Amino acid sequence: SVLQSLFEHPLYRTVLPDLTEEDTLFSYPNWLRFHIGINRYELYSRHNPVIAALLRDLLSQKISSVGMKSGGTQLKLIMSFQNYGQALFKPMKQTREQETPPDFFYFSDFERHNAEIAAFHLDRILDFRRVPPVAGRLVNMTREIRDVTRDKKLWRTFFVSPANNICFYGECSYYCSTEHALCGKPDQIEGSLAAFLPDLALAKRKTWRNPWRRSYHKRKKAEWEVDPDYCDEVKQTPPYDRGTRLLDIMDMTIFDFLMGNMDRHHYETFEKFGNDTFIIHLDNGRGFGKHSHDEMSILVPLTQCCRVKRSTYLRLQLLAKEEYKLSSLMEESLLQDRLVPVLIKPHLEALDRRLRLVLKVLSDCVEKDGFSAVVEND
């Protein structure tokens, strides 16, 4: 049991500063105990047996209502449960063995439920605690989707294919047509139930543009891809020289490079806390599309800025030693999801190879800017 060995190490016994009257955002239901547990520094906690218990609620709680987020990126469903808590649903768009084609742009890529799930476990293994909990689930797409929605936009798209299977596609913009439909064999589809952050009415979230946002156009290169001194100016741009913000982007950009998720054009914050809180890692569906390719474009914020947190550097160095190592720690935790295997074996292997490239990018960068200038100590 290597996953226990990891959490015995002192690097995972870090305690937080004291939480004041602020730093709070606000035996209840599990989704609500998760909400009140959101504070300034994290989104849940390591100890917190609620997170393990919220993952079971997403698996087996009765679906009470199903609705469709209109005008979304791709198909996203909103599941609301018996105990009034809700969750976000991404259905299975690609099989387990498939890889994204090489000729696909980052903006033509599918969202796959494995990434939403695996990003939560990988984030929990990196002790970031920024992703809302997400569990995989098989849904009888008759009993749990079609027959329990009063959203006619979704019900009308249900049909039966010449293979006598039940299919549906919803109504988004990319990939919501009969020719991209989602078909069970014959009536269970599988997808990721992502726990919901508290209602935005009573917990506003500021939406930030990140300075390394790609140019969602072909031929047109982005600012940071042409300017090698791009980050000398970003550490002089408003909010990025006061945190724990420039550093919070370095946590996130190592997260994204590990998964190959090159679609981190924005990040959300909790508003009530200001420029000095954590970054909520949402929309992780674009990772784990390629396991035979390491997308170095994602790391460019790290080679240009050349500074990380010591907390996250030491854990990454640890996650490379053979006695712990990412692959084995992911194959254990991801073994407790219903959708096993949530990641095929080459994807867990890419976690190992991508990790030592991040450690090589820090060592190659620590021998050009030196320690202390590179490694902040928290």
* Closer Cβ to its own copies, 108 or 237, answer by number: 108
State in angstroms the smallest separation of the CB of 43 from its own copies.
Answer: 23
**Site membership for its own copies, residue 160 (CB under 8 A):** yes
Query: Near its own copies by CB under 8 A, which window of 6-14, 59-67, 248-256, 358-366?
Result: 59-67
Is position 296 an interface residue for its own copies (rule: CB under 8 A)? no
Contact, 178 vs 164, CB < 8 A? Answer: no
Give the residue among 324, 326, 305, 297 at the shortest CA–CA distance from 369: 305
Q: Is 207 in the site for its own copies (CB under 8 A)?
A: no
| Residue 356 binding its own copies, by CB under 8 A | no
- Nearest-approach distance from CB 261 to its own copies, in angstroms: 15
Asked if 94 touches its own copies (CB under 8 A), the answer is no
Q: How many residues form the binding site for its own copies (CB under 8 A)?
A: 45
Q: Is 347 exposed, middle or buried (0-12, 13-18, 19+ CB in 10 A)?
A: buried
Which residue number, 86 or 327, has a Cβ lying nearer to its own copies?
A: 327
Question: Residue 36 or 160: which CB sits closer to its own copies?
Answer: 160
Question: One symbol per residue from 230 to 269: x for binding its own copies (CB under 8 A), - otherwise; what is it?
Answer: ----------------------------------------
Q: Note whether 8 binds its own copies by CB under 8 A.
A: no
Nearest distance from C-beta of residue 253 to its own copies, angstroms? 19
Q: Does 71 bind its own copies (CB under 8 A)?
A: no
Q: Long-range contacts made by residues 6-15, C-beta under 8 angstroms, separation at least 24?
A: 6/125, 6/318, 6/324, 6/329, 7/46, 9/318, 11/127, 11/311, 11/314, 11/315, 11/318, 12/46, 12/127, 12/315, 14/127, 14/311
Beta 182-183 vs 191-195: how paired, if at all?
unpaired
Asked if 105 touches its own copies (CB under 8 A), the answer is yes
Binding status of residue 151 toward its own copies by CB under 8 A: no
Phi and psi at residue 135, to the nearest 5°: -125, 145
Does 365 participate in binding its own copies (rule CB under 8 A)?
Answer: no
Told to check if 174 binds its own copies by CB under 8 A, we report yes
Residue 26 interacts with its own copies (CB under 8 A)?
A: no
Cα–Cα distance between 350 and 227 in angstroms, integer?
A: 29
Decide if residue 351 touches its own copies (CB under 8 A): no
Find the binder of its own copies among 9, 22, 36, 56 (CB under 8 A).
56
Nearer to its own copies, 346 or 370 (CB): 346
Does 147 qualify as catalytic in the annotation?
A: no
Residue 357 contacts its own copies per CB under 8 A: no
In the complex, minimum distance from the CB of residue 1 to its own copies, in angstroms, rounded to a whole number:
6
Residue 335 touches its own copies, criterion: CB under 8 A: yes
Q: Taking the complex as a whole, how short is the minimal distance between the CB of residue 256 and its own copies, in angstroms? A: 16
Catalytic residue among 57, 187, 256, 263: 263
Residues found near its own copies in the complex (CB under 8 A): 1, 56, 59-60, 62, 96-97, 102-106, 108, 138, 159-163, 165, 167, 174-175, 177-179, 181, 183, 218-219, 322, 327-328, 331, 335-341, 344-346, 349
| Residues annotated as catalytic (active site), given as ranges | 263
